[PDB]
RNA sequence: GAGCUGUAAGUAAGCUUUGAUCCAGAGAUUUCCGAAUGGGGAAACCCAGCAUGAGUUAUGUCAUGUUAUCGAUAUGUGAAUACAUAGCAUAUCAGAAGGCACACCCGGAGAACUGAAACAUCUUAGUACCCGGAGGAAGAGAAAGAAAAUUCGAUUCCCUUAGUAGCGGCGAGCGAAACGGGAAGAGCCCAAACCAACAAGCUUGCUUGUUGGGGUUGUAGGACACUCUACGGAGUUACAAAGGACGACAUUAGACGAAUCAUCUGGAAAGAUGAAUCAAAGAAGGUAAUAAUCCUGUAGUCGAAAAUGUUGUCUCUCUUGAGUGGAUCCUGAGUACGACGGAGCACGUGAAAUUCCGUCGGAAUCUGGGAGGACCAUCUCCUAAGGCUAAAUACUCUCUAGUGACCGAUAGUGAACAGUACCGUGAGGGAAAGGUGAAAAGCACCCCGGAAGGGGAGUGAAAUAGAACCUGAAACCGUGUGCU
RNA sequence: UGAGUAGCGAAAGACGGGUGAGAAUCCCGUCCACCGAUUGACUAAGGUUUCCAGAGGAAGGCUCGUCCGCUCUGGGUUAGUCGGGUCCUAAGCUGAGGCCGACAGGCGUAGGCGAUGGAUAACAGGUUGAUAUUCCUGUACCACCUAUAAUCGUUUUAAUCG
């Protein structure tokens, strides 16, 4: 389970090796957006002229998987409760850092 | 009053009544007397007039 | 708002129901003629209303227990 | 009482060729007689009002993609008055 | 615990870590009509009285309360008529009224087509329809019973007895019960004799009335006579009733939850190939093809501020129980029965006993009364004419969790997008209509054309996937050709 | 399929100019023709936005269409006196108590409701694309309330009201 600022790693599709990192969320089809990953090209008329631009379409968030911040590898994500509040995990190593 | 049959001599049958033998008497009612339909078998047995 | 109200004294919430009723007014003539271009303030004032009429009637409910 | 008897203005050309004149178009609540608007309006603006008209109008039938429906029925008032001007744009 | 302002896409203007949107519990608000109830009326409207209040020099206007009919409970008053009474008036209470899944249940009233190879007794059938009353069940229920052993011991329901015994234009057809095997199991309160009081007549004797106690039955019990005895039991589902405390479960939101990488084909891998791992978890659904290890989950474990529902332990609230005498007193009356006319019992009035309704008659009192299929005698069993009672049983418009050798868009609900288009004065009848793509990336720009349509270019794996959008049969309509 | 077949719903049009991609069919003009106890002008029932302006031409219009009672957008109905209610009653319908009836319910007294009838105060002119006895100007009338007042004189009576 991914938020907006994270830094995450591309696991199936075309674009599978990628970085990048989240910047739209979502929740409710589940489809976050990652810069410089599927993007598109709409034929867009004038509103000044328009023509093809290029942006970065949405995709299926289980497509994609965290990286550990010790050893850098994609890892899933548990809980634990720390002064009565809940953290994120990697499964690996210890707290995630997630701020912004 | 309820309901039964007429049955005739080939045992046909149709629907029929009987009554009761309500008269119209005067009788002691909550204070002041009123004038009421009772039948004969119970004016002989259960109320007086 | 609502814990801001409570500390209103009875006199104050009637005061306040009487102007943002008032300021209600101005914005829906202002949006028929056609120069408002700021819509978001019609809801938050009708929702100020309903808060202020919740709190009175609150008072009101819980004296007449005490009584 | 009063801000809940009118509801808003009407702006046409023939309400503004009116208000060449001193009368102004209102649409006011479809359960109020003329008097509550003319007293209404007198506490509202502070101006004297002379008289006041009133009609009632009918909903109509309308469209919106194969959605056949009605709008609201409504009452309008027009209000002469003798002195003052209300400011309005 | 980070986005949000319905389906619902836009733009605008905004809200939110000082915790929004969202989920559960409890509150507040709740226009008008409708039993509709101030009066009227063509529902969703019109017109009022009375009392307060705002406003006006004052009227007009407005706001808030209250005003149906029967019923109950008080008070006052009182006609033909003297007392009285019928009425009448005032004030408190809020008892009824209407609706439904009204499916199942209990009552009132009750067909015909049909079968009998016609039809009338009979059958369809006490069925359909109509009316009334209710409950989570209703009805029945504690022997005037079943029987014929050496008996049993309230009622209801299931299996058998058995298509037997019986009934029947002895035709068509209708059709039990006891015994036996099981589910469940529970018993009680009155009326009367009598006693103690109070009260009116009365003459203080009696009568009657009111309260309380007592008391409830068959190999007879109880009153009375006498002799032996006391707060432990009982309880709100009948058996009398209220209400407190502290608990324990279960609902109504939730939380944590193990384990995978690489290459090939491809638009995309979960597939193939290779090497690994978890399992109290290899149910299921998603994800650009087919995933135990990617996501939501699953096995397992944890969780409630508040409101309900059960259930314990205290509290609480009630209350003596035996024996002998047995025939001195009490033990349900227009009742039981009978005649006439009917109905219900498997049973068509018959050898009809047994049980109800209408009209007339009309008992007995323990040495009594009833039943055992006309009646009589002897035997055996029981004790009517007052009332209450859980469980085992029936049903599903609903709610929660699931299941299927059930359907897959002419099927399955009439209805996957509707009791709507539409038809009828009305009651009423009643359709047709699902699928772009993984992702809108839904075709910028150029050309012919008024437009509609089209040809290129571009997006896409694919545009003979372009919205009349998956696949795209046949009938039918055309264009070009080899032989004739 | 029948088949480019039957039909296209009573009748008099002609020409010039205009607009348009497109005109027998739309707009303007002249001439001609038809009705005229009516194909003219008012008010009711009934319908329910069909009314007006700007834009449009896929479907509807028995042809065409640049037009439209059709599609889109925005508008339009003003009352003390007009017709109803806050007035009256007819037939009829309901009906407190009441009478009758297996149930459901049927009838009916006082009283209500109910116009198609009785009562009842406004006319002339101006003005819009779309309303007018309603808006505007002029001149009226009818109810009700308060002030300013002669007449008012126990409130029997008297004026008064009843
Ligand atoms: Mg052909």
Redesign the pocket.
Known sequence: ?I??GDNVKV??????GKEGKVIA????K?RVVVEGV?I???????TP????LETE??I????V?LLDPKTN???????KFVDGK?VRIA?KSGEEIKSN | ???????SH????T???????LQKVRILVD??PKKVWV???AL???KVT | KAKEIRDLTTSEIEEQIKSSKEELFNLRFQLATGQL?????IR?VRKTIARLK?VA?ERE?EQSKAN | ?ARDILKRP?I????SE?MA?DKYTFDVDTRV????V??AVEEIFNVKVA?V???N??P??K?MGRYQGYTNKRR?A?V?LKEGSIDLF
């Open positions: 389970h938020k907006k696991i199936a599709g075309k674009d599978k969320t979502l929740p409710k589940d599927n598109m090209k709409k034929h867009q008329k004038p002229e328009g023509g093809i379409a949405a299926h968030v289980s497509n998987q590898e994609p890892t899933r994500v548990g809980y809940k499964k | 009053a309820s309901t039964g049959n007429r049955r080939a045992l046909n049958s629907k029929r009544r009987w009554n009761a033998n204070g002041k039948s004969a078998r002989k047995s259960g | 271009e700021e819509t978001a303030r938050t919740t009637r409910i | 009482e009407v046409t050309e023939k309400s009116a004149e007689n003329k008097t509550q003319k007293m008289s008209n009133i009609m109008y009918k109509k039938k469209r309008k027009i002469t």
